[PDB]
Structures are given as structure tokens and as C-alpha cells.
Design an enzyme around this catalytic site. Structure first.
Site: not given
Length: 409
Positions: A380-383, A359
Site C-alpha cells: 500500500h504505497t500511499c502508506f 498520502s
């Protein structure tokens, strides 16, 4: 720096410079930015103001700026990268462990077959104008007709339809249409400003039809929709946790102590009119959002060597060997599922696990120690980050992790 065509410079009785737009019929104190090279403002048959690039022959209702043009070019690169990865795209496939994706897909295939209408409809499009021709064609047909066998022609039917879905699924993101945007270029969203395109709603309906048709006819698309998008298709709760998947900054601000539905209501409604007239979303509800993504995007073998080569770690390669044991033991589908759990998606960058993105820039696959053993693993899929609790047994790590990626609660 000369004023664009249609503009005039005047001075008022107080000496203050100002500008007259003889086309829009506007006055302003702010000197309009020049149009970028090759761009010309024009007026359509109904008097509406649009812009045309005389090198790409593209058009837009959005007045082109440095930012809009930069977005467009980023999209040009993207589209070319995917298109160039076509060969890999054509290799995508579909077909206690209480979730049975295979059986779901078979049920769904059967459902579609029982709705499938006797052949066939012709969809006639060119590569150069794929998007517009597709829009005219697809909107010209009835939902019923669009459930018939597809004969796509670029002046064996399955591979050209396959290609058509591939290409169109790229074209759909063309920022010139003003339809989508990025929360980075990481997270795809409906553009709240889509209104600047007077026909935005018709286009969202078209896209709804498009996606539903891919599902109905068993064809993969190659678009990076977010998990909340799929959730929205399935009428599943969009919670606070989803905000981390979309705008992690906004989620952080919120977590210091319905903004993912507010702003795009009309667009979403038009999208679902189009979607639901082809394949009513309610009859998709035995699927979960990750399954739906896999269904639309296809599965692929994962390179375990690439994956391992490009992973980072409060731990090291020396309880992580348990993790990689877990990866190697599970099947293709569960690896796709684990990939979704960690990165938010079952799609991999054409380059591989090195080219992994987050992200706020590239962010390699990351596993870190946190929590107790009763803790389920977190992500924490954005990371692209896996929160791996200190487990004491391989069977326990495999149970917990299975439980986590299966989303049993």
C-alpha cells in the site's frame, strides 16, 4: 479592508451593497478579497488579465489567494531542498531473473544513438528566468534539432545540461503556472483548472518535449511524478489499484462496494504531442512503468542502516531478519525495485528513510503480517506499507518477494 485597485463600492435601489470591477467589467454582491502584499493586477497587450508580484517579479493568470500563495511557498521550500541536494543528485547512475533492465537500457541507448543528429544546438538560459527562457528556446526549435547534441549556456556541456535538466525539472512544478497540483503534497497530478492559464496547452507541450528530451539525451530529472503518469506514457492500463497509489480516500470510497483520465484530457493530449514529437512513446514499450521511472530519475545506493533504523512493524525485529537478508543479498537495482514496490517510487527524501512521506503525512516504512503462504506479498504505497505473508522458508520469502517486486503477474 480596502478594495483592490479597479474596484468600486456602490449601493442598489434596495440598499444592498455591491461591487463593480472596472477592469474585468463585472458586478457582484461579494466583496473581493484583497490581494496579498506585493501583488498587482495588470492587463497584457492582448487585453488579458494577469497578476504580478513586485518582490519575486513572478506572474500568474491565477488570482493570488491565501491558498495559492501557501502552495507557492511550499513549492519554494521543495525546490530549495532538491536544489540543495544537487551533490547527491549528481551521483545518481544507470549503466531466474527474466527481466533485464541493463539490456533494455543498452538497447534504448542504441536506439537514441541511431536517431541522434550531428551536433548541435545552443540553448541559452539564465538561472533567474530558467523556466521562461527554456520555454521560449525549446519551443523555438524543431524536434529534429532537439535531438541534436545540447549546448546549454548560462551566460563542460554535459554537466551544464545535467544541471539544466535538474533545475528545470524543479521549475516545471511552479504552482503559479497552474499546470500541476497535489491530490498532503503527496501525489502529483495535472491541474484540471490549468485552463485559467490561457497558454496551458503550449506549456504542457513544452513539458512533454522536456521529459522526452531527458529520456532521449540520457539525463535525469528530479520531479516526483506518480506511477500512473509513467504508466500513461507507456499506454498501460490505469486500473482501480492505481487509485490507491493516487487518492487513497477516493480508492477507499470506491472499494466500499476512469476518474484519473477524466478532467485532464486536453492537457494530457498536449503533453503527449510534445513528448511524442521528440521521442514517440510507443518506442518505449519494452520498459515497464517502474523501469521508466528509474530511467528518468536515476538509481542511487540505498543506506541499509538508515532503512533498517527507520522501519516499523503484527511482528518485530525477531522472518523479518529474512526480509533484511533479502534486502542485503539483492543488488542496487533490485533494491530500487523493492523501494518502488513498497513506496511507489525510486526516489528518496534528501533526509533519508526517517523523512519518508505518505498520502496523509509522514509514514515510516511498514511491514505487517497478513494472508497465507500462497499469498504474494502486497503493498500500500500511499502508506509505504508492505503486506508480508507468513512464509516458512527464506527461499520461499525470497521467491515470493522477488516475484512480487518483479511484477511477474
Amino acid at each position: 479592508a480596502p478594495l483592490p485597485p479597479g474596484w468600486e463600492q456602490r449601493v442598489d435601489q434596495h440598499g444592498r451593497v455591491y461591487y463593480v470591477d472596472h477592469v474585468e467589467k463585472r458586478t457582484t454582491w461579494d466583496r473581493p478579497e484583497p490581494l496579498p502584499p506585493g501583488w498587482e493586477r495588470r492587463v497584457d497587450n492582448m487585453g488579458r488579465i494577469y497578476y504580478v508580484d513586485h518582490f519575486t517579479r513572478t506572474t500568474t493568470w491565477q488570482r493570488p489567494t491565501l491558498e495559492s500563495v501557501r502552495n507557492y511557498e511550499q513549492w519554494q521550500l521543495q525546490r530549495s531542498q532538491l536544489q540543495g541536494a544537487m551533490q547527491q543528485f549528481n551521483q545518481r547512475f544507470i549503466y531466474a531473473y527474466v527481466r533485464d533492465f541493463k539490456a533494455k537500457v543498452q538497447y534504448f541507448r542504441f536506439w537514441c544513438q541511431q536517431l541522434a543528429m550531428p551536433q548541435h544546438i545552443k540553448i541559452t538560459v539564465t538561472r533567474k528566468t530558467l523556466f521562461e527562457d527554456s520555454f521560449q528556446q525549446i519551443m523555438s526549435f524543431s524536434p529534429q534539432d532537439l535531438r541534436r547534441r545540447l549546448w546549454v549556456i548560462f551566460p563542460d556541456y554535459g554537466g551544464v545540461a545535467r544541471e539544466w535538466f535538474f533545475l528545470l525539472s524543479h521549475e516545471v512544478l511552479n504552482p503559479m503556472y497552474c499546470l500541476f497540483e497535489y491530490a498532503d503534497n503527496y501525489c502529483l497530478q495535472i491541474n484540471p483548472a490549468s485552463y485559467i492559464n490561457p497558454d496551458h496547452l503550449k506549456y504542457f507541450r513544452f513539458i512533454g518535449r522536456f521529459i522526452a528530451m531527458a529520456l532521449f539525451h540520457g539525463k535525469f530529472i528530479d520531479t516526483g511524478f506518480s506511477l500512473p503518469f509513467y504508466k500513461r506514457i507507456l499506454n498501460k492500463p490505469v486500473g482501480l489499484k492505481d487509485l490507491e497509489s493516487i487518492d487513497p480516500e477516493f480508492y477507499n470510497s470506491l472499494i466500499w462496494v476512469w476518474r484519473l483520465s477524466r478532467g485532464v484530457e486536453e492537457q494530457t493530449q498536449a503533453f503527449f504531442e510534445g513528448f511524442n514529437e521528440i521521442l514517440p512513446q510507443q518506442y518505449l514499450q519494452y520498459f515497464d512503468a517502474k523501469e521508466l521511472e528509474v530511467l528518468l530519475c536515476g538509481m542511487q545506493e540505498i543506506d541499509l542502516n538508515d532503512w533498517q533504523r527507520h522501519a516499523i512493524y503484527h511482528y518485530t525485529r525477531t522472518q523479518i531478519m529474512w526480509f533484511w537478508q533479502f534486502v542485503k543479498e539483492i543488488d542496487n537495482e533490485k533494491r530500487m525495485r523493492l523501494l518502488q514496490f513498497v513506496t511507489g517510487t525510486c526516489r528518496l527524501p534528501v533526509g533519508g528513510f526517517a523523512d519518508l512521506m505518505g498520502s496523509n503525512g509522514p509514514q515510516k516504512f511498514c511491514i505487517e503480517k497478513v494472508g497465507k503462504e500462497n499469498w504474494l506479498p502486497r503493498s500500500h504505497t500511499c502508506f509505504n506499507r508492505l503486506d508480508l505473508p507468513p512464509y516458512k522458508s527464506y527461499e520461499q520469502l525470497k521467491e515470493k518477494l522477488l516475484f512480487a517486486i518483479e511484477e511477474t503477474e
